[PDB]
Structures are given as C-alpha cells and as structure tokens.
Design a protein around this nucleic acid. Structure first.
Lengths: 196, 55, 49, 49, 108
DNA sequence: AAAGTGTTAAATTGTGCTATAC
DNA sequence: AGCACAATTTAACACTTT
C-alpha cells in the first residue's frame, strides 16, 4: 500500500541509489526512513517572476514584527519613566533606584532581543525559500510546515520511497550522462575521481 | 547558558537510528491536556460531524 | 605536576569548568540530548558509582 | 518475515481508510520499510530481527 | 534416531495420461482495471458471475447478468456512533451555539 | 588584519574471509 | 580477531571578501 526501496540498492557499498541521485547515504537514510522532507520539484517561473511581490509582502510581516517591537519598547520606556518618576517623586535610597533603572534596561533588552530572535527566524525562512532546488533536505520539521502553509504553491516535497520514486521519475539520464562525460574530460581533482 | 541553550537546540537534529527511540522523540513534542480542554475538543468534534452530516 | 603530557593537554583542551565539560560528556555519550541538571551530576554517578 | 510484512501492510491499509494523523501513518510506513528490509537482507540496517 | 516428517498430502501412482480427459469450457472474467482472465471449468458446472482473479481483485463475467450488489452496508461510520449516543435536538442546539461562537470571536 | 570557502590529505567506518571429511 | 581494502569524514591548506 506504500512503496518500499529494495535494500540491496540503498545499503550497498557503494550505494547505487546514492550515486544515481547524487545524494549522500547519510541523507538517503534520513529521507527514506521518514526523518527529513525532500523537495522534489520547484516551479522556477513563478518563483522567478513573483519574487518581487513576495519579498514586498515579506517586508510587511518584518515591519509588523518591528512595529510590535517598538510598541513594546515604547511601553518599556513609558514604564521606566513611570518608575523613575513615582519612586523618585519623594525621597528614596540610591541603590534601589539603580536597580530599578537596571531592571527597566533588562526588560527593554528582553523585548528587543526576543524581537531579534523572531526577526532572524523570519529571515531564515525566506533565505531558505529563495534557494529552493530539488534533491534538497529540510531537517527542521517545523520549517517545512511554514513553507507549506506559506509559499506552498511553488514546490512539492515529500518523505520516503514515494519521494524517491518521484525523483527517479523526473530523472533525465542523458543530461547526467553528458555532464559526467564532460566533467572527467575537462576538470580534474577529486571531482573527476568521483564522477567516474 | 549559551551552551546549555544550544545543545538543547542541537539535540533535535540527530538521527537516532533506533526506530523506537525515534517514535518516542517524535511523540514527545506535543503537550498533554487538562480535564476541561478535552470537553472543548469533543464539542468541536461533534459539531464538525453534525455539520458534515448536514452538508 | 611532573606530568609533561598532562599540562600539554591542559593547554590544548579548551574546555574549562564543571558544567562546560558535563555538556560535552553528555553530548558525546548520548549523543544529541537536551542538557539538564540531573543528567549533569547523576550520569557520571550512574555509570561508575 | 512474510507474516510481518503482510501484517504491517494490512494495518497500513486499515489506517489509511480509517483516516489518521500524519504521525501514525508515517510510523506505519517506516515499520513497513523495516519489515521488507528484514525480509530481503536481515541484520544490515539496524539490529537484526 | 531419524525423525521423518511430511508436509500433509499424498503421492498417487496413476501413470499419467494425455488423451482422454473430461471436456472443459473456458469462461472469461473481467476485473476492474480492464484485465481479462480465462478460467477452465467442467462442462457440468454452473459458471459463477464473479471470480477472484489472479490479479488479486474480483472480476465479473463478460456477460450482462448483473447478479447481486447484495445490499452490503458501510458499517459504523463514526456519525452513526455519534447519532446512537446523542440525539438531533442536542446537536442542533449545540452546533448553532458553536456557530454563534464563530460570530462573536471574529469581531470580539 | 578577520571571515569564510572550496580544494586537498590523514583519520574513520564498514564490508568480507578465514580447510577437509565423520 | 585480524588482515586488507575502499568509501567517507576533520583538519590543513591557499584564495577571495569584510
């Protein structure tokens, strides 16, 4: 009821499925035993031409994160103004006022750094989307759901032997044959020794 | 705690080739429920079933 | 103190402290598990003690 | 080994028609893969049956 | 000791033949994915309509008899397990309730 | 001057074999 | 257990940004 890879053609030495797809065996075992999604196709035309509108919409969410950040930062500024106003409206000790001004800076730092962490997350998902290509891997298992619910129409990804069957379907043998003929003819080094 | 709050991040990206341990680490990521959340989930289930029947 | 190899490894080791070595031992032994404070001071005493 | 293959195949065929979350179906497909691998060449990937 | 064993069966000693054998007729069934299977039968035999073919799935005869759907049901299709324990008035006064929660939560 | 970045060697894992008859 | 062998990594390198 679901496809299954033959074990002789995956766990050999050298692995024939790894050579036929240019995938490492440590990545092949992550794919076919349900540990990492693999991109199996990507529409290059839609991702090429709608890239500007997609990054323009991405800047909207980035500025929404920055706007909630500066709103909480203004809240922390008004809160620390209220602390240093109402505590210092009367006579007070010095070191507790130092601790109050320190804790205000601590909560402001917490706000801007939580915002920095989620800003880096939103940068990372877009940097992952902009370099999409088949025979990749997504080991995160949360980033793939973020790529499926958002920009989920530009590609396809799967797990296991049905994804390996889909990669074998879209596999033009003559292109890889001519490229492997040309690498050993022109280039040299470890790249030539591998391509044989 | 950068290291302490790292190696916690770098833990969930390893293979763990024993499949039983892989299944246990997979099911560990969902939290439990209290005594009154299951009531809300069951109400949502029964409402959705009635709506699909009326559909 | 005599130990011409021991101070050499103490230079080239780079890991300083109790917790900083405990996370390294746990991450090399499990491997890849969240470091806690039970698994720091009870793993070494639950393997040889 | 034939019994384990057709057992996990029948259980996958029942879990798919019943409607199931993705975790149970993926666990069943991984068990099916390990059963067929144990049938063809035992003790190669992982521990032997 | 020796421990003889047998897969349960028999070996008969009729010398084989190949000329006089009671006569047979061939039926042909057709499965769901357009496959054709030829089955021999004795002449004094009621040829059945459906046959479990070599493909693994059932195939009807090539004629147009249409014997039986036999009125087989679902079984329990959840719902039924919902409708048998909870009645329609309790659901209609609940679903609409949930429906109003879609109206109030959307605008706050 | 740092910081990567890809290309090039020693370490690092896995596979296969190990006589004959009672 | 080891003996050999070939495939797959740390690290050691100059080259090019920052």
């Amino acid at each position: 009821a679901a496809p299954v890879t033959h074990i002789w053609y995956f766990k050999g030495v050298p692995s024939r499925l790894g050579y036929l797809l240019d995938l490492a065996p440590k990545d092949l075992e992550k794919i076919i035993y349900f540990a990492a999604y693999v991109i199996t196709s990507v529409d290059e035309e839609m991702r090429h031409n709608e890239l500007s509108t997609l990054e323009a919409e991405m800047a909207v969410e980035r500025k929404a994160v920055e706007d909630q950040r500066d709103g909480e930062l203004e809240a922390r500024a008004q809160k620390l103004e209220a602390d240093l106003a109402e505590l210092e409206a009367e006579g007070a000790k010095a070191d507790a006022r130092r601790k109050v001004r320190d804790g205000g800076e601590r909560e402001m730092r917490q706000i801007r750094d939580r915002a920095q962490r989620e800003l880096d997350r939103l940068e990372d998902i877009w940097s992952t989307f902009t370099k999409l290509a088949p025979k990749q891997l997504i080991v995160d298992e949360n980033l793939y759901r973020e790529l499926v619910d958002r920009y989920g129409e530009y590609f396809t990804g799967a797990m296991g032997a049905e994804s390996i069957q889909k990669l074998i379907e879209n596999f033009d043998i003559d292109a890889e044959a001519e490229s492997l003929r040309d690498v050993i003819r022109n280039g040299k080094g470890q790249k030539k020794l591998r391509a044989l | 705690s950068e290291a302490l709050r790292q190696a916690r991040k770098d833990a969930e990206l390893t293979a763990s080739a024993d499949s039983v341990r892989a299944y246990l680490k997979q099911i560990g990521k969902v939290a439990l429920l209290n005594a009154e959340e299951e009531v809300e989930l069951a109400k949502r289930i029964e409402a959705g079933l009635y709506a699909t029947q009326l559909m | 103190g005599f130990s011409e190899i021991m101070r050499s490894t103490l230079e080239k080791d780079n890991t300083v402290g109790t917790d900083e070595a405990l996370l390294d031992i746990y991450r090399k032994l499990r491997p890849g598990e969240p470091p806690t404070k039970e698994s720091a001071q009870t793993l070494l005493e639950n393997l040889f003690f | 080994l034939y019994r384990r293959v057709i057992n996990r195949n029948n259980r996958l065929k029942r879990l798919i028609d019943l409607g199931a979350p993705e975790i149970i179906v993926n666990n069943e497909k991984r068990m099916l893969q390990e059963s067929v691998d144990a049938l063809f060449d035992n003790g190669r990937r992982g521990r032997p049956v | 000791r020796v421990l003889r064993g047998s897969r349960l069966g028999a070996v008969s000693y009729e010398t084989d033949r190949n000329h006089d054998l009671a006569p047979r007729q061939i039926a042909r069934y057709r499965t769901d994915n357009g496959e054709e299977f030829e089955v021999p039968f004795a002449d004094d035999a009621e040829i059945p309509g459906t046959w479990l073919c070599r493909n693994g799935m059932e195939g009807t005869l090539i004629e147009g008899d249409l014997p039986e759907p036999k009125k087989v049901k679902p079984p329990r299709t959840h719902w039924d397990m919902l409708l048998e324990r909870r009645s329609i008035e309790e659901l209609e006064e609940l679903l609409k309730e949930r429906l109003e929660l879609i109206r109030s939560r959307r605008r706050g």
